[PDB]
Scaffold this active site. Structure first.
Site, PDB file in Angstrom:
ATOM      1  N   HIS A  40      20.969 -68.920  11.629  1.00  0.00           N
ATOM      2  CA  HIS A  40      21.792 -69.147  10.998  1.00  0.00           C
ATOM      3  C   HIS A  40      21.577 -67.132  10.345  1.00  0.00           C
ATOM      4  O   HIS A  40      22.902 -66.682   9.889  1.00  0.00           O
ATOM      5  CB  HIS A  40      22.598 -69.124  10.249  1.00  0.00           C
ATOM      6  CG  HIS A  40      24.071 -68.627   9.987  1.00  0.00           C
ATOM      7  ND1 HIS A  40      24.675 -67.858   9.182  1.00  0.00           N
ATOM      8  CD2 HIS A  40      25.565 -70.067  10.321  1.00  0.00           C
ATOM      9  CE1 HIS A  40      26.262 -67.649   9.546  1.00  0.00           C
ATOM     10  NE2 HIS A  40      26.655 -68.990  10.906  1.00  0.00           N
ATOM     11  N   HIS A  77      -2.687 -66.096  18.499  1.00  0.00           N
ATOM     12  CA  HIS A  77      -2.468 -67.431  18.771  1.00  0.00           C
ATOM     13  C   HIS A  77      -1.341 -68.406  18.313  1.00  0.00           C
ATOM     14  O   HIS A  77      -0.932 -68.966  19.301  1.00  0.00           O
ATOM     15  CB  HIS A  77      -3.752 -68.540  18.049  1.00  0.00           C
ATOM     16  CG  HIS A  77      -5.362 -68.664  19.598  1.00  0.00           C
ATOM     17  ND1 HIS A  77      -5.928 -68.754  20.118  1.00  0.00           N
ATOM     18  CD2 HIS A  77      -5.382 -66.828  19.687  1.00  0.00           C
ATOM     19  CE1 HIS A  77      -6.970 -68.100  21.016  1.00  0.00           C
ATOM     20  NE2 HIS A  77      -6.779 -67.204  20.832  1.00  0.00           N
ATOM     21  N   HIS A 112      -1.565 -77.706   7.951  1.00  0.00           N
ATOM     22  CA  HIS A 112      -1.451 -77.639   6.780  1.00  0.00           C
ATOM     23  C   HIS A 112      -1.358 -79.166   6.101  1.00  0.00           C
ATOM     24  O   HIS A 112      -1.416 -79.130   4.761  1.00  0.00           O
ATOM     25  CB  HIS A 112      -0.717 -77.435   6.474  1.00  0.00           C
ATOM     26  CG  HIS A 112      -0.410 -75.771   7.479  1.00  0.00           C
ATOM     27  ND1 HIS A 112       0.932 -74.698   6.479  1.00  0.00           N
ATOM     28  CD2 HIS A 112      -1.184 -74.668   7.566  1.00  0.00           C
ATOM     29  CE1 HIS A 112       0.584 -73.990   7.385  1.00  0.00           C
ATOM     30  NE2 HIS A 112      -0.446 -73.645   7.574  1.00  0.00           N
ATOM     31  N   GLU A 127      24.908 -75.773   3.962  1.00  0.00           N
ATOM     32  CA  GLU A 127      25.259 -74.930   5.236  1.00  0.00           C
ATOM     33  C   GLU A 127      24.739 -74.622   5.969  1.00  0.00           C
ATOM     34  O   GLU A 127      24.102 -74.877   7.179  1.00  0.00           O
ATOM     35  CB  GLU A 127      26.521 -74.671   4.920  1.00  0.00           C
ATOM     36  CG  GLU A 127      25.788 -73.466   3.876  1.00  0.00           C
ATOM     37  CD  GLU A 127      27.174 -72.437   3.442  1.00  0.00           C
ATOM     38  OE1 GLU A 127      27.532 -72.106   4.112  1.00  0.00           O
ATOM     39  OE2 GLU A 127      26.891 -71.787   2.370  1.00  0.00           O
ATOM     40  N   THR A 128      23.011 -74.030   5.185  1.00  0.00           N
ATOM     41  CA  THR A 128      22.092 -73.550   5.495  1.00  0.00           C
ATOM     42  C   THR A 128      21.335 -73.816   4.643  1.00  0.00           C
ATOM     43  O   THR A 128      21.476 -73.754   3.746  1.00  0.00           O
ATOM     44  CB  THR A 128      22.859 -72.395   6.141  1.00  0.00           C
ATOM     45  OG1 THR A 128      23.623 -71.640   6.361  1.00  0.00           O
ATOM     46  CG2 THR A 128      21.959 -71.084   6.766  1.00  0.00           C
ATOM     47  N   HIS A 163      21.337 -74.144  10.664  1.00  0.00           N
ATOM     48  CA  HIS A 163      22.128 -74.727  10.418  1.00  0.00           C
ATOM     49  C   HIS A 163      22.941 -75.710  11.682  1.00  0.00           C
ATOM     50  O   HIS A 163      22.667 -75.040  12.802  1.00  0.00           O
ATOM     51  CB  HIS A 163      23.466 -73.246  10.405  1.00  0.00           C
ATOM     52  CG  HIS A 163      24.861 -73.221  10.000  1.00  0.00           C
ATOM     53  ND1 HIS A 163      25.635 -73.175   8.699  1.00  0.00           N
ATOM     54  CD2 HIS A 163      25.859 -73.973  11.363  1.00  0.00           C
ATOM     55  CE1 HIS A 163      26.620 -72.891   8.686  1.00  0.00           C
ATOM     56  NE2 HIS A 163      27.368 -73.787  10.691  1.00  0.00           N
ATOM     57  N   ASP A 174      -5.710 -75.862  12.667  1.00  0.00           N
ATOM     58  CA  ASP A 174      -6.258 -75.824  11.435  1.00  0.00           C
ATOM     59  C   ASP A 174      -4.237 -77.090  11.209  1.00  0.00           C
ATOM     60  O   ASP A 174      -3.556 -76.652  11.013  1.00  0.00           O
ATOM     61  CB  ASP A 174      -5.258 -74.438  10.561  1.00  0.00           C
ATOM     62  CG  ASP A 174      -4.810 -74.210   9.169  1.00  0.00           C
ATOM     63  OD1 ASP A 174      -4.642 -75.258   8.443  1.00  0.00           O
ATOM     64  OD2 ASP A 174      -4.935 -73.193   8.482  1.00  0.00           O
ATOM     65  N   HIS A 232      -1.494 -75.460  13.668  1.00  0.00           N
ATOM     66  CA  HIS A 232      -1.463 -74.811  14.238  1.00  0.00           C
ATOM     67  C   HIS A 232      -3.271 -73.591  14.351  1.00  0.00           C
ATOM     68  O   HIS A 232      -3.740 -74.078  13.633  1.00  0.00           O
ATOM     69  CB  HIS A 232      -0.690 -73.009  13.486  1.00  0.00           C
ATOM     70  CG  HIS A 232      -1.536 -72.577  12.759  1.00  0.00           C
ATOM     71  ND1 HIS A 232      -2.066 -71.624  13.010  1.00  0.00           N
ATOM     72  CD2 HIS A 232      -0.576 -73.039  11.464  1.00  0.00           C
ATOM     73  CE1 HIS A 232      -2.544 -71.638  11.070  1.00  0.00           C
ATOM     74  NE2 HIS A 232      -1.371 -71.939  10.426  1.00  0.00           N
ATOM     75  N   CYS A 233      -2.965 -73.016  15.404  1.00  0.00           N
ATOM     76  CA  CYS A 233      -4.377 -72.731  15.987  1.00  0.00           C
ATOM     77  C   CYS A 233      -4.710 -71.657  14.967  1.00  0.00           C
ATOM     78  O   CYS A 233      -3.862 -70.364  14.575  1.00  0.00           O
ATOM     79  CB  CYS A 233      -4.737 -71.400  17.409  1.00  0.00           C
ATOM     80  SG  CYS A 233      -6.036 -71.049  18.408  1.00  0.00           S
ATOM     81  N   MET A 263       0.943 -71.581  19.791  1.00  0.00           N
ATOM     82  CA  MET A 263      -0.472 -73.022  19.349  1.00  0.00           C
ATOM     83  C   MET A 263      -0.184 -72.932  17.741  1.00  0.00           C
ATOM     84  O   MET A 263      -0.201 -72.867  16.865  1.00  0.00           O
ATOM     85  CB  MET A 263      -1.556 -72.773  19.544  1.00  0.00           C
ATOM     86  CG  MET A 263      -2.173 -71.774  20.652  1.00  0.00           C
ATOM     87  SD  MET A 263      -4.032 -72.049  21.074  1.00  0.00           S
ATOM     88  CE  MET A 263      -3.929 -73.979  21.262  1.00  0.00           C
ATOM     89  N   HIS A 283     -10.246 -71.690  20.819  1.00  0.00           N
ATOM     90  CA  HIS A 283      -9.888 -71.874  20.030  1.00  0.00           C
ATOM     91  C   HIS A 283     -10.004 -73.099  19.049  1.00  0.00           C
ATOM     92  O   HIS A 283     -11.241 -73.733  18.892  1.00  0.00           O
ATOM     93  CB  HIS A 283      -8.597 -72.924  20.873  1.00  0.00           C
ATOM     94  CG  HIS A 283      -8.187 -72.683  22.141  1.00  0.00           C
ATOM     95  ND1 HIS A 283      -6.516 -71.645  22.242  1.00  0.00           N
ATOM     96  CD2 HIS A 283      -8.199 -72.452  23.376  1.00  0.00           C
ATOM     97  CE1 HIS A 283      -6.236 -71.387  23.181  1.00  0.00           C
ATOM     98  NE2 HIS A 283      -7.554 -71.577  24.015  1.00  0.00           N
TER      99      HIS A 283
HETATM  100  O1  LIG Z   1      -2.719 -71.989   7.209  1.00  0.00           O
HETATM  101  N1  LIG Z   1      -3.294 -70.965   7.533  1.00  0.00           N
HETATM  102  O2  LIG Z   1      -2.953 -69.600   7.620  1.00  0.00           O
HETATM  103  O1  LIG Z   2      28.517 -71.668  11.573  1.00  0.00           O
HETATM  104  N1  LIG Z   2      28.198 -71.282  13.052  1.00  0.00           N
HETATM  105  O2  LIG Z   2      27.161 -69.707  12.167  1.00  0.00           O
HETATM  106 CU   LIG Z   3      -6.131 -70.989  20.104  1.00  0.00          CU
HETATM  107 CU   LIG Z   4      -1.301 -71.543   8.467  1.00  0.00          CU
HETATM  108 CU   LIG Z   5      28.490 -69.970  10.401  1.00  0.00          CU
END
Ligand SMILES: O=N[O-]
Ligand SMILES: O=N[O-]
Ligand SMILES: [Cu+2]
Ligand SMILES: [Cu+2]
Ligand SMILES: [Cu+2]
Ligand SMILES: O=N[O-]
Ligand SMILES: [Cu+2]
Ligand SMILES: [Cu+2]
Ligand SMILES: [Cu+2]
Ligand SMILES: [Zn+2]
Ligand SMILES: [Zn+2]
Ligand SMILES: [Zn+2]
Ligand SMILES: [Zn+2]
Ligand SMILES: [Zn+2]
Ligand SMILES: [Zn+2]
Lengths: 334, 334, 334
Positions: free
Chosen positions: A299, A138, A93, A272-273, A248, A91, A128-129, A143, A88
């Protein structure tokens, strides 16, 4: 120079909580030290007993959220116990160079390493791995998690005015690719290694069998619901290291949202979303104004209700008839 | 009036390069003349010998990037040689009217046409083929690229301060829909026409068989990696004419990103991962601070590592221990 | 206090139109009263006679667009006639509390209810049916539409300058999941209830059989095309209550676009293609400069041309050779 700075040590906590931290601070930069230990394990991911041959940072999906300030240095010790079967790494970001640190943290079972990087950019960032040749496996096996890098003077709105949260929750959303056998039942694997080939085949279809918050259907529901009170501002950190999602809050909003998750950019209001790109973490603030049980979900409602990407927030306080009132309850039609 | 303006002539170059151009300029508006010649051909798109009955502008996927300034007029001559089997045309998202020019550039094999439009809006814009009744097929078979329209005074940050790139690369990402026969092997077609019906069937599943940068798995890897040096700013132009993608630079960031690709809007900063909507081109600037091999990929990691949507940038220069340092190399656990 | 305010009554109109309303207004807040009646019915959704066991607000997909101003209160009477088979309710994303109102509007066939909420946030917001245990089914079967909450002083550009539309159109995009039998033909169900189990199975694949604007392939094409004239500004409201889409106007642009749909945020300009997150409504303004037939579509071109997500706008007026000119018509190659 990072060698001259004070070192501090942070104790991580299990999602959905986030470890104690300051937002705005008078403190100068520090080298903040964390440790995580990788744990491969079989996990039950739904109500019918389906298992996943999983891989985790610190025993949870997602891994714990690490919190520092812009200008700090993160110094992580990554431990891969001999009880694990796979190599393992990590990384970040939020980091600059060496494939996010992956190149400098390659650890076989029974090994460990210590990485330092400067958190010179504010925001929520996925970590993440990423072992060469097996990166997607992974990641989708569990991960990943979030590094939150707060601006030294706290969050700000588009006009530069102060924003804050009173409580922070971290939600990792995992698109899972569990194979089935000829009988149409999900396969149960004795080891991690044995799940690989069948899983890659499911992955390549791009259709998750399950999409879950925090490692399982219902992880954030019922007794495990998030909590808040009317008048409290919550930060909802949402990570998705592999696939897009669209958070949401039912009966609520994103009051201030950084959907790409980078705090030097102005937030959007009244959403909303919002949209978390696969490979990123985003963050939304909301101040509760009504009590009751809210749903917090992806959503695409199929992804939420059928495949698992939904949780709950139970909110205490006094109902507000100005915001909403049942004028006439359900009753027969004239 | 466009008739009174000076005409200039531009020689296009093959992706991932972009033809020589100025950013900020003291020049007034011109009619900028380009020519592209369509080439239908069979192309090998992966390591195992899979072919695609492809269609291209100028022999490449993507087509070449055309660069002008806001207020210029683009004047394209589109040539469809008699050696091609299908009719074609061109739809410039950067243009106003007549289905992007598609209605005025319908060319059967052995024909050509010349379109002029005013590039009155700054940004990266998709151009693509769009013959009535067969639009998706022409697009997914490879007929797209980017028109970059720079502001006359160059790129600007949210506060109106100057931004620049020292080198520009263009990356087109292609979701491919290669049919399989009863034996589960990919089909190889003797002609373009014969691939059509089977391909439409795969298209309708919405599951690509492959997703590649610049026409093939590994097109931008190893010996064909992009290059830069520490201290240089690169512009990464990313087009996806049919399907969403989520670009990420591993070990890097989007320093300034216009993910919807329109330069009159303020860019976002510090992005880990951005989002190109299917049917658009976006642009990110990044200044390298560490040397080494970076991966530039679609951060649906299945789409990247399994299906092909990943490349590399090889960066020269001096490592920076302040940004990142291996404090303790991998070694046994105490 | 909402009890002291004047009440007004609004008569809804069928999509794609939107009911008469003011943008900027000198009026103070009102309680605006609407009524909608749910209608379950079988609908033909494509050219080959495929049916959908559908569910609607007011007999249309999408439901009608409700328009108020920020500070108004929406007071909806929701009627579920005894001729319907299922219970229903309504969740307004524009509202605060009680799962968007869903908890307070549960109506069995033969019942009705009246909900009031304060529209304290400007933007286009999805409303949709959300009965516990069957939310996705009701949504994907057609039970959604848009609440537009305009700022009291009208729309504004990033610099706070006035924006307006001369005509508004509402487009709902529906990802449908129609089952097939062993013969590969779409199934036709005698009742709504009988379609359920087979439909859920298709839903879980995440692959729509059809994706349509306003309830059917071609709903907004040919004779049912949207209309405008050169010099007129149109608002295009786009709702997608379950799945992402990427609107584009062929030969046009989004002049000012709020893709997350929330008017207190600055719009983006010059967009080729924008992004509506599943679970949201967005809005774009465009001023026509060329006459002709435009296509307005989801720019996953498979989703548009193969699966149904495309319409047309027929625009009257005078062609403009400065914006675009056929310099040389299609003709043989020298
Ligand atoms: O951030 N490596 O996909
Ligand atoms: O806004 N209810 O999915
Ligand atoms: Cu891993
Ligand atoms: Cu990445
Ligand atoms: Cu909704
Ligand atoms: O821009 N035509 O899809
Ligand atoms: Cu073509
Ligand atoms: Cu297009
Ligand atoms: Cu319903
Ligand atoms: Zn700190
Ligand atoms: Zn507070
Ligand atoms: Zn120029
Ligand atoms: Zn430079
Ligand atoms: Zn009003
Ligand atoms: Zn007007």
């Amino acid at each position: 120079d990072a060698d001259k700075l004070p070192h501090t040590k942070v104790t991580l906590v299990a999602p959905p909580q986030v470890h104690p931290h300051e937002q705005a601070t008078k403190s100068g930069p520090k080298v903040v030290e964390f440790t995580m230990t990788i744990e491969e394990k079989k996990m039950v991911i739904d109500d019918k007993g389906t298992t996943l041959q999983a891989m985790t940072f610190n025993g949870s999906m997602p891994g714990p959220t690490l919190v520092v300030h812009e200008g700090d240095y993160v110094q992580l010790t990554l431990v891969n116990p001999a009880t694990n079967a796979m190599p393992h790494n990590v990384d970040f970001h939020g980091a600059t160079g060496a494939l996010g640190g992956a190149k400098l943290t390659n650890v076989n079972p029974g090994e460990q390493a210590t990485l330092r990087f400067k958190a010179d950019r504010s925001g929520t960032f996925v970590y993440h791995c990423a072992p060469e040749g097996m990166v997607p496996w992974h990641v989708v096996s569990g991960m990943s998690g979030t590094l939150m890098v707060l601006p030294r003077d706290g969050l700000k709105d588009p006009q530069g005015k102060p924003l804050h949260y009173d409580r922070a929750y971290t939600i990792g959303e995992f698109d899972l690719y569990i194979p089935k056998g000829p009988d149409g039942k999900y396969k149960d694997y004795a080891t991690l290694a044995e799940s690989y080939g069948d899983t890659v085949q499911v992955m390549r279809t791009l259709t998750p069998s399950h999409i879950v918050f925090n490692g399982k259907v219902g992880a954030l529901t019922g007794a495990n619901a998030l909590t808040a009170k009317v008048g409290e501002t919550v930060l909802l950190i949402h990570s998705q290291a592999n696939r897009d999602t669209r958070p949401h809050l039912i009966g609520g909003h994103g009051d201030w949202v950084w959907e790409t998750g980078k705090f030097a950019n102005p937030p959007q209001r009244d959403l909303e979303t919002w949209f978390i790109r696969g490979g990123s973490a985003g963050a939304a603030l909301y101040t509760f104004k009504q009590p009751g049980v809210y749903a917090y979900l992806n959503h695409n409602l199929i992804e939420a209700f059928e495949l698992g990407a939904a949780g709950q927030i139970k909110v205490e306080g006094k109902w507000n008839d100005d915001l909403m009132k049942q004028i006439k309850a359900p009753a027969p039609i004239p």
